Design a protein around this ligand. Sequence first.
Ligand SMILES: [Mg+2]
Ligand SMILES: [Mg+2]
Ligand SMILES: [Mg+2]
Ligand SMILES: [Mg+2]
Ligand SMILES: [Mg+2]
Ligand SMILES: [Mg+2]
Ligand SMILES: [Mg+2]
Ligand SMILES: [Mg+2]
Ligand SMILES: [Mg+2]
Ligand SMILES: [Mg+2]
Ligand SMILES: [Mg+2]
Ligand SMILES: [Mg+2]
Ligand SMILES: [Mg+2]
Ligand SMILES: [Mg+2]
Ligand SMILES: [Mg+2]
Ligand SMILES: [Mg+2]
Ligand SMILES: [Mg+2]
Ligand SMILES: [Mg+2]
Ligand SMILES: [Mg+2]
Ligand SMILES: [Mn+2]
Ligand SMILES: [Mn+2]
Ligand SMILES: [Mn+2]
Ligand SMILES: [Mn+2]
Ligand SMILES: [Mn+2]
Ligand SMILES: [Mn+2]
Ligand SMILES: [Mn+2]
Ligand SMILES: [Mn+2]
Ligand SMILES: [Mn+2]
Ligand SMILES: [Mn+2]
Ligand SMILES: [Mn+2]
Ligand SMILES: [Mn+2]
Ligand SMILES: [Mn+2]
Ligand SMILES: [Mn+2]
Ligand SMILES: [Mn+2]
Ligand SMILES: [Mn+2]
Ligand SMILES: [Mn+2]
Ligand SMILES: [Mn+2]
Ligand SMILES: [Mn+2]
Ligand SMILES: [Mn+2]
Ligand SMILES: [Mn+2]
Ligand SMILES: [Mn+2]
Ligand SMILES: [Mn+2]
Ligand SMILES: [Mn+2]
Ligand SMILES: [Mn+2]
Ligand SMILES: [Mn+2]
Ligand SMILES: [Mn+2]
Ligand SMILES: [Mn+2]
Ligand SMILES: [Mn+2]
Ligand SMILES: [Mn+2]
Ligand SMILES: [Mn+2]
Ligand SMILES: [Mn+2]
Ligand SMILES: [Mn+2]
Ligand SMILES: [Mn+2]
Ligand SMILES: [Mn+2]
Ligand SMILES: [Mn+2]
Ligand SMILES: [Mn+2]
Ligand SMILES: [Mn+2]
Ligand SMILES: [Mn+2]
Ligand SMILES: [Mn+2]
Ligand SMILES: [Mn+2]
Ligand SMILES: [Mn+2]
Ligand SMILES: [Mn+2]
Ligand SMILES: [Mn+2]
Ligand SMILES: [Mn+2]
Ligand SMILES: [Mn+2]
Ligand SMILES: [Mn+2]
Ligand SMILES: [Mn+2]
Ligand SMILES: [Mn+2]
Ligand SMILES: [Mn+2]
Ligand SMILES: [Mn+2]
Lengths: 65, 116, 127, 198
Amino acid sequence: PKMKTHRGAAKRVKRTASGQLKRSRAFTSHLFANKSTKQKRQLRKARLVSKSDMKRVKQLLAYKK
Amino acid sequence: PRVKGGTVTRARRKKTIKLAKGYFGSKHTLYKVAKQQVMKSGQYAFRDRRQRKRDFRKLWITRINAAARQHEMSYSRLMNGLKKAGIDINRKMLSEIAISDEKAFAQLVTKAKDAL
Amino acid sequence: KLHELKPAEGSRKERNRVGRGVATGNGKTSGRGHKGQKARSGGGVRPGFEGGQLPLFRRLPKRGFTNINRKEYAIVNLDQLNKFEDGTEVTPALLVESGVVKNEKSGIKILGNGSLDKKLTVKAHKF
Amino acid sequence: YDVLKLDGTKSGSIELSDAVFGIEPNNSVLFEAINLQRASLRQGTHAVKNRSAVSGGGRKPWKQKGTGRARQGTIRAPQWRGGGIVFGPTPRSYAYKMPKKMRRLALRSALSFKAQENGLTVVDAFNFEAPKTKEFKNVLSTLEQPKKVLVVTENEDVNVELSARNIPGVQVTTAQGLNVLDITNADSLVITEAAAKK
RNA sequence: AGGACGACAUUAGACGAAUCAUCUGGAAAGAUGAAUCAAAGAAGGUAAUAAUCCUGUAGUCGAAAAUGUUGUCUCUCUUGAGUGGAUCCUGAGUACGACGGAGCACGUGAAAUUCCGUCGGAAUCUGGGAGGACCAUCUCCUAAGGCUAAAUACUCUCUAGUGACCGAUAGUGAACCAGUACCGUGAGGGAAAGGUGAAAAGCACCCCGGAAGGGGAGUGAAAUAGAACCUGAAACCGUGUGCUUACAAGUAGUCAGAGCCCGUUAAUGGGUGAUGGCGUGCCUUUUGUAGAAUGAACCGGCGAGUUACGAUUUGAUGCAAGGUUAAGCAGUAAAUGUGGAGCCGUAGCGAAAGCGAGUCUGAAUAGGGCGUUUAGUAUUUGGUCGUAGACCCGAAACCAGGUGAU
RNA sequence: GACAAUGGUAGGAGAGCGUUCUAAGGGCGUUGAAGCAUGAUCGUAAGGACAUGUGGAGCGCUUAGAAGUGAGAAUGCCGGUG
Ligand SMILES: [Mg+2]
Ligand SMILES: [Mg+2]
Ligand SMILES: [Mg+2]
Ligand SMILES: [Mg+2]
Ligand SMILES: [Mg+2]
Ligand SMILES: [Mg+2]
Ligand SMILES: [Mg+2]
Ligand SMILES: [Mg+2]
Ligand SMILES: [Mg+2]
Ligand SMILES: [Mg+2]
Ligand SMILES: [Mg+2]
Ligand SMILES: [Mg+2]
Ligand SMILES: [Mg+2]
Ligand SMILES: [Mg+2]
Ligand SMILES: [Mg+2]
Ligand SMILES: [Mg+2]
Ligand SMILES: [Mg+2]
Ligand SMILES: [Mg+2]
Ligand SMILES: [Mg+2]
Ligand SMILES: [Mn+2]
Ligand SMILES: [Mn+2]
Ligand SMILES: [Mn+2]
Ligand SMILES: [Mn+2]
Ligand SMILES: [Mn+2]
Ligand SMILES: [Mn+2]
Ligand SMILES: [Mn+2]
Ligand SMILES: [Mn+2]
Ligand SMILES: [Mn+2]
Ligand SMILES: [Mn+2]
Ligand SMILES: [Mn+2]
Ligand SMILES: [Mn+2]
Ligand SMILES: [Mn+2]
Ligand SMILES: [Mn+2]
Ligand SMILES: [Mn+2]
Ligand SMILES: [Mn+2]
Ligand SMILES: [Mn+2]
Ligand SMILES: [Mn+2]
Ligand SMILES: [Mn+2]
Ligand SMILES: [Mn+2]
Ligand SMILES: [Mn+2]
Ligand SMILES: [Mn+2]
Ligand SMILES: [Mn+2]
Ligand SMILES: [Mn+2]
Ligand SMILES: [Mn+2]
Ligand SMILES: [Mn+2]
Ligand SMILES: [Mn+2]
Ligand SMILES: [Mn+2]
Ligand SMILES: [Mn+2]
Ligand SMILES: [Mn+2]
Ligand SMILES: [Mn+2]
Ligand SMILES: [Mn+2]
Ligand SMILES: [Mn+2]
Ligand SMILES: [Mn+2]
Ligand SMILES: [Mn+2]
Ligand SMILES: [Mn+2]
Ligand SMILES: [Mn+2]
Ligand SMILES: [Mn+2]
Ligand SMILES: [Mn+2]
Ligand SMILES: [Mn+2]
Ligand SMILES: [Mn+2]
Ligand SMILES: [Mn+2]
Ligand SMILES: [Mn+2]
Ligand SMILES: [Mn+2]
Ligand SMILES: [Mn+2]
Ligand SMILES: [Mn+2]
Ligand SMILES: [Mn+2]
Ligand SMILES: [Mn+2]
Ligand SMILES: [Mn+2]
Ligand SMILES: [Mn+2]
Ligand SMILES: [Mn+2]
């Protein structure tokens, strides 16, 4: 059987790069006005899946790009 | 293809049991028991091969102590003089001379008695 | 030489047979070295993802073909029985420059930085 | 070029063919095709008994504790006499595939060894029934032989000890050409190879 | 919508090629010395291993009948095509809606498309449906009636064959009179157990004995193959006896070592062992086990990391800015030839419209993210993961069908 | 030729021994195969030979391929016998 793609992650990954998974970022939903405007503006810009986690999540997005 | 058990086992086990040859009772006849004995038997011989080196040096030393004692000299003193004498004979030789040749051993005694 | 074969050196290695004697006769020692030992790959005992999701996907997406077209000294195009594009959904012609020959390009949606050079040696545009 | 000995004779009527027939050496591919051939030639008809679901059985032989015997499940669990067989052979394919160009690299390097050793080319002739081929094979030739031609039924030599592979130069295989220590070729047959091999 | 003529086929079968001598030997097919056949050197049998000894094989013929099967006559059955359109006709308790369900990969969701229950309930070529809620428009169709081969699934059975599948604890539960001894009220559970020899030549006869069993004599190549019969391991049980042993505290051995006895795969030999040194089995599990923690009476057999398909990585090989086929046909259950749909690569960035060696954010040709500067791809050995029971054995339990108030 | 390193549980890496089957090559075998028994044999290990007795059909060697490939423990299963 073909490995299934964890489509719940794929709805939040975006591959591209030279193999790196792109981003999406936390605390970005609701409940503002407790984060700083500094925290607010900076969590807006996106950052990759970490080396240590790509070690763990490597299998699920095997079909992304 | 199925491989059967085949001969390989018996031939292996008999190897062991032949090693357990002088052994007592079923330590000479059962594999399971004789395996353990042959294991230990070499585990002893491995250490015993080192120990015999020291069991033997102690034998000569006492024998040297004995013939030194006959010339009113402790074994402690004799070796100190033989070092300063520059004699470099070694116990097993030194002791064997004391048994095979009373005169030769006496000479080295007097050699070591001076250079003190 | 059918009785004295030999595989290319470096291919082929004897597979590892765990559990067959005391040059390793195991795997781990307790916990999940139980048969069919779990942990989901992912399920690290608290979220893992659960952190944002951004999505869509729609329709029309072209198929690129860069100006490394050192083809003939002229002639028309889209002809890709020639060894160039294949599996095309459209055909944009992009840059990475070296319009070293003069010809007439033809495909749908040409890139401006490209077509500035294609038309600066022989002129060429189409749908 | 290579002499074309007369059938039964010596009419050494030379003619040219090489490069993708001589010249070529290779070995590392030549082995790997030999394995792909014999892989494919076997059915994997073997299948062992119980995935424990095979064999009648499956009540619990006695209650867990109170007995002083070990706990048991099916009386067909694999450590029993007559029980299931963990990870026996099951029927399966036993047969892979190798890239096209490399398949061609085999046959050339196969035939080129026969060129580097020795392998005869011939006129043809034909008729009916062959204790005669022994006299035809005794022109000189050797222990194991194959012959090729686009046509067929010139092979009522099925029944010779050794030497009884004969196939069109399009049914040609890496086995023979490796197996057989000499090989004999009608021209035009050897032309049909030279056509395809390029 | 049912039946009359002669080709092939199925169900019995026939022909079918070519060897002698010797040595060994119980026996020749083996060895050896000369031969022969072959559209037949597949296989099995024959006193050891046989192309030429037999049954056969390649190949060739063969059917009274019985079905099966078709070519073809008959046999029915046959009426076959176009222009225009006034006013008719093209499947009603239906399509459809609401409600409760159900189904579509699609969990009520924005929910198209499709079906049930229940009340409602249309239209009539100026018509109706569908195109993923819905309206308009456009395009495709024409529901509410029915029948339709082939390509697809399966194997209790038949014939013919095949296997880097088992070879008697394996392989079917069952090689043997197995769903049988056996067990249960019943449903139901369910074994064990193959092998004398080439040939029964299966031991006439004498002998001890009631017999059983045995010593002779015999058949046999062999019964030190004699029936509970090929081989005949180990545990276990015994007979004989070379060295040793009744003042000694021992995980049984190891190291040292006299004495005695023997004489080998002939090598700084073998057996035994007064006496001295040293010395608390193994496995598991443990901070730590001589452990008084666990396991094993012993010996034998059996008994656990597999395979498929995906992923990733390494190694090998082929091509290379390309690499490569899938089904399918062809083929001898191959290899291979075919087949370029397809997949990955040559370009990236963005949620996206989209722009492009650059793009995104941004008001910015600031900065900053990802990318540019160059190598991939196919097969495959190995490692590992994922899907599978997924290394093996083990629950108390749960559900479904049944069987039981003797 | 010197000179260094070489205790080791989980565990990683490496090189190998043997078992059954296949392929090709080359062989042995009723003047006695496998198996079994015995030995004072060889190799660093797994392990390999040779000799003799037994036995009465078969079996190995080389190279490569594939695995139902290796047992001492599971209150493991089955048999036999303490
Ligand atoms: Mg993208
Ligand atoms: Mg992040
Ligand atoms: Mg049950
Ligand atoms: Mg033939
Ligand atoms: Mg004879
Ligand atoms: Mg002969
Ligand atoms: Mg026979
Ligand atoms: Mg309704
Ligand atoms: Mg059959
Ligand atoms: Mg009588
Ligand atoms: Mg026999
Ligand atoms: Mg015995
Ligand atoms: Mg404890
Ligand atoms: Mg204990
Ligand atoms: Mg290159
Ligand atoms: Mg930038
Ligand atoms: Mg940058
Ligand atoms: Mg119930
Ligand atoms: Mg004889
Ligand atoms: Mn998905
Ligand atoms: Mn997500
Ligand atoms: Mn928000
Ligand atoms: Mn804060
Ligand atoms: Mn077998
Ligand atoms: Mn075993
Ligand atoms: Mn290994
Ligand atoms: Mn454990
Ligand atoms: Mn663990
Ligand atoms: Mn595990
Ligand atoms: Mn389990
Ligand atoms: Mn069952
Ligand atoms: Mn008990
Ligand atoms: Mn079975
Ligand atoms: Mn006949
Ligand atoms: Mn005949
Ligand atoms: Mn004869
Ligand atoms: Mn026939
Ligand atoms: Mn209608
Ligand atoms: Mn509708
Ligand atoms: Mn509706
Ligand atoms: Mn509804
Ligand atoms: Mn729509
Ligand atoms: Mn069938
Ligand atoms: Mn047996
Ligand atoms: Mn009964
Ligand atoms: Mn018989
Ligand atoms: Mn009698
Ligand atoms: Mn006789
Ligand atoms: Mn018996
Ligand atoms: Mn017997
Ligand atoms: Mn005393
Ligand atoms: Mn005494
Ligand atoms: Mn004490
Ligand atoms: Mn002692
Ligand atoms: Mn002590
Ligand atoms: Mn163990
Ligand atoms: Mn105790
Ligand atoms: Mn415990
Ligand atoms: Mn116990
Ligand atoms: Mn046991
Ligand atoms: Mn891991
Ligand atoms: Mn696994
Ligand atoms: Mn070490
Ligand atoms: Mn050290
Ligand atoms: Mn380890
Ligand atoms: Mn390893
Ligand atoms: Mn041999
Ligand atoms: Mn065998
Ligand atoms: Mn096994
Ligand atoms: Mn028992």
